[PDB]
Design a protein around this ligand. Structure first.
Ligand SMILES: OC[C@H]1O[C@@H](O[C@H]2[C@H](O)[C@@H](O)[C@H](O[C@H]3[C@H](O)[C@@H](O)[C@@H](O)O[C@@H]3CO)O[C@@H]2CO)[C@H](O)[C@@H](O)[C@@H]1O
Ligand SMILES: OC[C@H]1O[C@@H](O[C@H]2[C@H](O)[C@@H](O)[C@H](O)O[C@@H]2CO)[C@H](O)[C@@H](O)[C@@H]1O
Length: 255
């Protein structure tokens, strides 16, 4: 059992895969109340009942992103030992990700269930800047839209509860300190099991950024990490009650 009740990171191994869990309240300046994140060998759970919230920077909009991840998260300069990432995007033949999840939250809270990676020019950067890319995949959202603006839609297959389906994904793009691309599933799923190949999203992103003047050689960027978690909160959020459970996690990176 790994149990955290304050912001921090812990490495763990689940089904033979080395991972990191981060009770991530990155944009919260202050709060009162409770947070708890736990891994017990079969599932990872997170619960929060916090109040008196204020952001470190409202321009960033969200307040936090409790999560777990496989690989190297640039911002924390951290990877658990034994990860196959980072690798150049061009070396990835396929990268299957599967996980069961159940998200619960008070109705008014801005929240998503989103996975993400950071594509960087150098292998072990400690930040993203111009030339780098953040790609997110949102399977659920409540009172929250992605940053930037919606520019396209893509039809990308995934397996939902064991059944192959074709999802329709909106692609939202923002040019900030780095390029932000968020694919948002149009029929969000709040509880279920999903399995999909990240390569489809990398392919769509590479097409969308083909005429970019900021992102130069997409396929030469390093795919550093795969994060799974829930962003939550807006600049007006003063309290947050929500949590989640993730189970049945597996990956298959073919390089
Ligand atoms: O303490 C280490 C380092 O953390 C920096 O915060 C990171 C977070 O760790 C990371 O989760 C967050 O990712 C968000 C991203 O910025 C958004 O564009 C979008 O992708 O959603 C992500 C999850 O909400 O990025 C921030 C950095 O921007 C601290 O900022 C830094 O001071 C600190 O040293
Ligand atoms: O850290 C940035 C954050 O942006 C979130 O979208 C915000 C956007 O930043 C803001 O300009 C717009 O007015 O509101 C949206 C929220 O509805 C985005 O949802 C996050 O993924 C991203 O992390």
């Amino acid at each position: 059992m790994v149990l955290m009740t304050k912001p921090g990171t812990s490495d763990f191994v689940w089904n033979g895969i080395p991972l990191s869990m981060e009770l991530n309240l990155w944009n919260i300046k202050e709060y009162s109340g409770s947070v708890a994140m736990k891994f017990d060998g079969e599932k990872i759970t997170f619960d929060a009942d916090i109040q008196n919230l204020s952001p470190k920077e409202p321009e960033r909009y969200v307040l936090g992103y409790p999560e777990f991840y496989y690989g190297y998260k640039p911002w924390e300069n951290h990877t658990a030992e034994g990860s196959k990432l980072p690798v150049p995007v061009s070396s990835m033949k396929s990268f299957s990700v599967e996980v069961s999840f159940d998200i619960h939250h008070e109705p008014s809270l801005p929240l998503n269930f989103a996975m993400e990676t950071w594509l960087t020019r150098e292998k072990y950067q400690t930040e993203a800047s111009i030339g780098d890319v953040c790609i997110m995949v949102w399977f659920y959202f409540n009172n929250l839209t992605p940053g930037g603006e919606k520019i396209e839609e893509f039809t990308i297959p995934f397996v939902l509860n064991g059944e192959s389906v074709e999802g329709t994904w909106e692609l939202w793009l923002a040019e900030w300190g780095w390029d932000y691309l968020a694919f948002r599933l149009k029929d969000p799923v709040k509880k279920g099991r999903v399995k999909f190949d990240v390569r489809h999203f990398l392919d769509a992103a590479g097409k969308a950024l083909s005429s970019s003047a900021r992102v130069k050689d997409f396929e030469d960027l390093y795919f550093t990490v795969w994060e799974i978690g829930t962003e939550f909160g807006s600049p007006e959020t003063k309290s947050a009650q929500f949590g989640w459970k993730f189970e049945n996690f597996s990956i298959d990176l073919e390089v």
